């Protein structure tokens, strides 16, 4: 179970002076999604390459999935999987219609539900009940990444969590609770004048999964004073 945020650990959006658009895009409509696909290549020992194509916008013909270790790449190489992630292009390396992401891979066979399950997201602002809504999945075991993306995607659209130039919130973190264990991600960029998408998204490279029946989601936002 992950230690909760230490005092002053959470990133403050006011200390980020670059453009918040570079965070927003990661949780806008476009993302990598493929169902029942199998890897076709590999660059380095901790990645897998899939022939997942963006036919709608034409932005990529292949996706490189990066994991934290060799064991994860080996586990999924040659398995039929589902892929779901927030992808990036700047400093995406395959050695030009390519994209990279971290984690987001679940075995297909035996992981499918026959109906969608709902997971309630509870959102708090300055300690108060702000709103709640449901995200849905048809996976028994679903990546935290997929649930985080679905959660933030809603909050961008409906609460302007990220706007092109800034955020209306000072801090935010999303906490996942599964039985006796929890963990969380900071929703705001690191302080300074540039946002490193690759470095941010690398947090998902553990391929962390949760049980879609058991998992609960709480989002804690604080407003700028």
């Amino acid at each position: 179970s992950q230690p909760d945020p230490k005092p002053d650990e959470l990133h403050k959006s006011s200390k980020f002076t670059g453009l918040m658009e570079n965070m927003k895009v990661l949780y806008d409509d476009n993302h990598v999604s493929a169902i029942n696909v199998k890897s076709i290549d590999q660059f380095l020992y901790f990645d897998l390459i899939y022939s997942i194509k963006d036919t709608k916008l034409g932005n990529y013909d292949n996706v490189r999935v990066e994991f934290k270790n060799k064991d994860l790449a080996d586990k999924y190489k040659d398995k039929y999987v589902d892929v779901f992630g927030a992808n990036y292009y700047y400093q995406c390396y395959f050695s030009k219609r390519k994209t990279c992401m971290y984690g987001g891979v679940t075995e297909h066979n035996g992981n499918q539900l026959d109906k969608y399950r709902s997971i309630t997201v509870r959102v708090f602002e300055d300690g108060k009940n702000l709103l709640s809504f449901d995200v849905q999945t048809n996976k028994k075991k679903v990546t935290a990444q997929e649930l985080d993306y679905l959660t933030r995607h809603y909050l961008v659209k409906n609460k302007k969590l990220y706007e092109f130039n800034n955020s209306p919130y000072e801090t935010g973190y999303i906490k996942f609770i599964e039985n006796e264990n929890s963990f969380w991600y900071d929703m705001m960029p690191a302080p300074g004048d540039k946002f490193d998408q690759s470095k941010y998204l690398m947090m998902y490279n553990d391929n962390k999964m949760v049980d879609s029946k058991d998992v609960k989601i709480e989002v804690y936002l604080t407003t700028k004073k």
Partner: antibody, heavy 120, light 108 residues
Framework: EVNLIESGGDLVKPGGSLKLSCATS????????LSWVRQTPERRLEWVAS???????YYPDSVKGRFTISRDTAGDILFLQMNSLRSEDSAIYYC??????????????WGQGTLVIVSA | DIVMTQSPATLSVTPGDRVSLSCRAS??????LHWYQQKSHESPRLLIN???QSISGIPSRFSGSGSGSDFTLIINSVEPEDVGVYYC?????????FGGGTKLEIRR
């Protein structure tokens, strides 16, 4: 692991003042919603004050402008300053912490409570 | 303010009974409704959060249901150690408010 220890309860004359303290341990003090809830002689529970992780404070109308919730993050101590005390303020005062995080309306951990008596 | 009503305010039950305790809110609070047990000489203890969501450490015989204005706590096969006062609580909006409690006593 989580522990909350209230102190400062006393007998005070109507119109007097008292400051309560809640010394905490076993968790990151700034990461949770913290509140005071009181239990009256009639056994009713009443929400008295809340402070969010970011320091936003909230009160019911019955204590607004008389009570002040505050904290000392470095000391892991939560306070309740009570002014212009009334007989209706006589109660056991408990310090409480949220179950998971920065929500102030869910009381998962309670102290043993400290007794306040308002009478001449 | 949102007034929380617990009625019956007292129950006398037989060990092994399935016991149903009622809480009603004067305005809708969605599922932002939490339940507490208080035993003699102890502080209250959180049993259920968000109407029906169970909490690590609480015995399985405790469960909850409802959304909006009408809520129920169920003790499935009540035990002698369950005697005490059960409170519901609006955690939806300010002021946070508690029900008056239902006092549970057991037969022997």
């Amino acid at each position: 692991e989580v522990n909350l220890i209230e102190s400062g309860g006393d007998l005070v004359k109507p119109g007097g003042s008292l400051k309560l303290s809640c010394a905490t341990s076993g968790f990151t003090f700034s990461a949770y919603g913290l509140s005071w809830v009181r239990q009256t002689p009639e056994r009713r529970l009443e929400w008295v004050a809340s402070i969010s992780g970011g320091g936003s404070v909230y009160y019911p109308d019955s204590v607004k402008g008389r009570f002040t919730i505050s904290r000392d993050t470095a000391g892991d101590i939560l306070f309740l300053q009570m002014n212009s005390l009334r007989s209706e303020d006589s109660a056991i005062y408990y310090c409480v912490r949220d179950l998971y995080g920065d929500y102030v309306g869910r009381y998962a951990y309670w102290g043993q409570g400290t007794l306040v008596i308002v009478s001449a | 303010d949102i007034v929380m009503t617990q009625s019956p305010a007292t129950l006398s039950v037989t060990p092994g009974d399935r016991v149903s305790l009622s809480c009603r809110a004067s305005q809708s609070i969605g599922d932002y409704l939490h339940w507490y047990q208080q035993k003699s000489h102890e502080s209250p203890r959180l049993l259920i959060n968000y109407a029906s969501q169970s909490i690590s450490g609480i015995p399985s015989r405790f469960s909850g249901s409802g959304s909006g204005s009408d809520f129920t706590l169920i003790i499935n096969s009540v035990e002698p150690e369950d005697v005490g006062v059960y409170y519901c609580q609006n955690g939806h909006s300010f002021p946070y408010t508690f029900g008056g409690g239902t006092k549970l006593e057991i037969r022997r």
